[PDB]
Amino acid sequence: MKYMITSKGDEKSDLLRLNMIAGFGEYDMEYDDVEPEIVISIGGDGTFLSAFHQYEERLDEIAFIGIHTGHLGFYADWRPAEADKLVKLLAKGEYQKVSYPLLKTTVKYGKEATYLALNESTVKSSGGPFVVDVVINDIHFERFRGDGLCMSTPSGTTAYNKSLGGALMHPSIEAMQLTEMASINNRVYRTIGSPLVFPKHHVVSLQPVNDKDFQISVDHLSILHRDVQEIRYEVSAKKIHFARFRSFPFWRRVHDSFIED
Amino acid sequence: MKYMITSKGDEKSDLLRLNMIAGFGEYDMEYDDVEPEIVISIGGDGTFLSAFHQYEERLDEIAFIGIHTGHLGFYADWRPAEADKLVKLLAKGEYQKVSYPLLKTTVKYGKEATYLALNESTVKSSGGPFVVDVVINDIHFERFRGDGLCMSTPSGTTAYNKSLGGALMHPSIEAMQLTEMASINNRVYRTIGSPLVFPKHHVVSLQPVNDKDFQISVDHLSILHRDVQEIRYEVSAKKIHFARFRSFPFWRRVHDSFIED
Amino acid sequence: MKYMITSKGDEKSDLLRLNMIAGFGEYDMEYDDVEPEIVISIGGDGTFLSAFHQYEERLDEIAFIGIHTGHLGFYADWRPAEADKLVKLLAKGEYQKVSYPLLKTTVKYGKEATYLALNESTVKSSGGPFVVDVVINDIHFERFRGDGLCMSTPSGTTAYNKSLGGALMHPSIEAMQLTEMASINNRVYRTIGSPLVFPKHHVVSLQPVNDKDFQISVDHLSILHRDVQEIRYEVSAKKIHFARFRSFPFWRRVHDSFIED
Amino acid sequence: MKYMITSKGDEKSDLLRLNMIAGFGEYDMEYDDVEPEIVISIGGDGTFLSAFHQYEERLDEIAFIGIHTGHLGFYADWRPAEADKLVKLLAKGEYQKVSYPLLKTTVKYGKEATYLALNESTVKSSGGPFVVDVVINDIHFERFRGDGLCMSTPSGTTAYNKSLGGALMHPSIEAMQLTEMASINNRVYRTIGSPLVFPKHHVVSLQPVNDKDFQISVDHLSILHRDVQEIRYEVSAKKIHFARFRSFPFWRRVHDSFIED
């Protein structure tokens, strides 16, 4: 079927891509970066994140594969030595697909713009003070004053969420996790402090208090948004599909990345 | 139907219990502490935890209610003023039931003994050094050296899990969360540090290295177990059922207990 | 002697200032905002921080007083009701002075600019990735990748340092404390994680790796500095002097601000 | 002069000790384990901690040396290969001494018993609930409910204090640091949470509320104390003296032990 390959750009990934294309030329596999059914990312987790957002509007018709030319990634969990074994099994097909939940972010103006995140979405202050009211399912939960907030997907919990003290969540759990960035807690201000894990259909809303200008990041893309009235977080109805060929469990991936390999 | 009421023992809870029994005498509600279908706990979360373990073998035939005579609890979320409104709606029936996940703990010897936890189960050292190998689904994940480990239910995440840095999980999520107690991390020893959230059917196993004697707590019951070869944690197939009469969402319960009421 | 008074600008602080000036007119106390020997700050800790930096070049010839018109501050620890008792004892003199350590920050270019901080100095990334080599007394200690670093004075440990997990230090200790902001820790990157407390004459140096542009804050003043080759932190030889009239210990100030008053 | 050597007991340390004694026999150095002026510890930090408490009543007349036969320690910072270079310079003398602060613990009954700690002293509950009132310089600061409290020396901050989130303190600072163990924080109970660093002459007192029985550890020695009315912590007037032969700075020792060597 149709396939494409993204590269980190260095010599190692660029030439691994040209070799896989050549091996794909020995099967009925046509290169198409417009309507691919298989997207192969060669590089790191950042290169994989770029590939996800490249084809975020065809998520249901695409299976993703990650090849790490440097260290082991959580999305790029295939070694370069397995590339030739990869093209053969990609060609035959009959592979299984695994799906991970995604995070939907809605940003309102005084108009709405929505985004999809594979790792997390964060809201941070321009430079001045960051105060936001946190509303959970139309109920005011807290008034946060600090550096920012981070809402993570399950597969994103090993990323930014982890450095903020969040828990690591197995990706079969359809949930999202909110973490704080340097919360002020004294006589006037009071936050929960602990990370929060929300199920499906739960809507977490961030609302401004004085300043209505902040930086909003979705994965690796920080966007300054003006005249923002609301930021809505909920588990997306859409999912990312991975091409599954071997057993590499999430907890073994966590062990290899953080304990030792 | 059949019902019983447990009391914390102080004058306030003891006499609130006698008044509810009297009001129950005005309906076809018989007092039975052997085979009750409704268990009312008057006191605190500790009094509710006692009531759960009193009837842990009839969980599927019982609906629990908690009345807090002191501060607001997470299980005792009914105020004493609503007691007379409680007996009437308890009598008519037609109420809804909500269910929270539980944690199953299996302890092996060189024989097996299993327990059910509503808050958490913890493993801690006698006094000497605590080393355990942590195995996740038959894969060795880490060698923990520290004070202990805590495996929490969703509704237990606001308890011991919270004080150990764990995340707060909505109880509709069928999961368990593992947290560390003062982990040694240097050149020799290495743990994940972050809390871990496991889905159903995932089995977390704790295995001894040198000392085979530790204290194992299940909710409020610390048991010294000897010749222990394994401690197995997984989300239980059993659930606790609450009598639902009004809307008191979990996040509002979290807000009132920790932010301010 | 010579004195001046800064105000937060609201009606409460502005009119408390005019009343203290009037009461000062009944003594041999001349108002001089050029060469004052007594600087009175009416407002909050932010108003006091502004007053410190207003007269940072005459620190050795000035005694500071803070009056909080809102909640209790750590520098503004005098209540408005004590203002008339304040002017009398300010007039007679014979008061004692207490001194708190300060933090010196040196920023080098490819030229040097130095600053004095009463709370802390932080280095953060523009928007892109933040990597800095941390050198302690000319020895490379770690390569930090994350959101930023915070170096706090003793009296600043209850501020930004506290929200980043740092320890609270009694101000009689001539030291500085470094804390991390969301450190990446995996197979490639590795930081100490724990806060670090340095004595006098110890020099902590931050050095760039790729990007040489960051935001550098000194108290409430965030400055974008370009072509930065080094940022040097050490306990300053200069000290801030407070006019001491009553006993308000630091730990009681901590208790009232964070436990409850 | 007079000297002695303690060994961990394994073959490596036992035979390194016999070789150093033989090399010492070639100088005017007499072996005396009753009144030694030089105490050499061969093993780990635990073996060094044992040697400190062996001679805690002659601290002012003794210089300590640590040799690590396993991994690098913070007190045993000499490699076994340097043992022959050690005996020569130990024999000539003319070496310098460095001193680290110690922690004094006083335990009162209804009588007083005092102890000296090189790492830390901790107070923990038997099994039941742990509540203690924390008094700082005769002022009630907080009512702690949790697992326990840890008061660390500067050189102990890389040990138990570190695993509890405490800051790492350079040993030239005459101070002590208090850290919490799993504090309960809700509507009823409230602790500072942050670690606390106290200077000299500051007295931190722990006082019971209901239960008067707890476990009190001083370094590696956990002692169950009954009928305890008070536990008093303050920086000791006594200091431990190390034989200084080379430059191995504390921060390099921290780097090698935790970052990588």
Ligand SMILES: C#CCCCN(CC#Cc1nc2c(N)ncnc2n1[C@@H]1O[C@H](CO)[C@@H](O)[C@H]1O)C[C@H]1O[C@@H](n2cnc3c(N)ncnc32)[C@H](O)[C@@H]1O
């Ligand atoms: C410029 C620029 C940004 C580089 C591009 N960058 C791609 C990625 C990634 C990634 N994804 C995962 C994952 N799912 N699980 C585990 N590790 C993961 N990483 C690793 O993450 C490191 C930094 O990139 C790399 O080793 C990479 O293998 C963006 C991602 O960076 C993460 N992030 C941002 N700030 C912080 C912070 N203070 N602390 C921790 N993580 C942070 C945010 O998550 C943001 O989606």
Ligand SMILES: C#CCCCN(CC#Cc1nc2c(N)ncnc2n1[C@@H]1O[C@H](CO)[C@@H](O)[C@H]1O)C[C@H]1O[C@@H](n2cnc3c(N)ncnc32)[C@H](O)[C@@H]1O
């Ligand atoms: C003696 C004795 C034990 C008293 C009986 N105790 C009953 C309970 C409870 C409870 N359950 C919940 C819940 N589900 N959510 C939120 N708060 C909850 N609490 C509150 O918890 C406080 C202490 O009891 C009380 O305010 C109570 O309203 C047992 C429970 O105590 C918890 N626990 C034990 N050690 C710690 C610790 N270091 N830090 C934090 N929590 C701890 C363990 O969880 C253990 O299941």
Ligand SMILES: C#CCCCN(CC#Cc1nc2c(N)ncnc2n1[C@@H]1O[C@H](CO)[C@@H](O)[C@H]1O)C[C@H]1O[C@@H](n2cnc3c(N)ncnc32)[C@H](O)[C@@H]1O
């Ligand atoms: C716009 C704008 C900034 C407002 C002006 N702001 C003046 C002050 C102050 C102050 N000084 C102390 C002190 N010494 N001890 C204890 N509380 C103290 N505060 C309290 O601090 C709160 C925020 O201002 C107020 O309640 C105030 O009573 C600057 C100071 O803010 C602190 N800071 C900045 N970001 C964070 C953060 N994420 N988390 C925690 N603190 C932070 C940095 O420290 C920076 O010096």
Ligand SMILES: C#CCCCN(CC#Cc1nc2c(N)ncnc2n1[C@@H]1O[C@H](CO)[C@@H](O)[C@H]1O)C[C@H]1O[C@@H](n2cnc3c(N)ncnc32)[C@H](O)[C@@H]1O
């Ligand atoms: C049985 C038994 C106890 C073994 C004997 N043990 C001797 C020592 C030591 C030592 N001293 C220092 C130091 N000064 N700096 C840095 N690392 C240091 N260690 C290292 O410490 C590890 C465990 O021993 C070893 O790798 C050792 O090289 C006692 C010391 O253990 C420390 N401790 C106790 N519980 C915890 C805990 N939950 N987390 C962290 N540390 C803990 C308490 O501190 C108590 O003084």
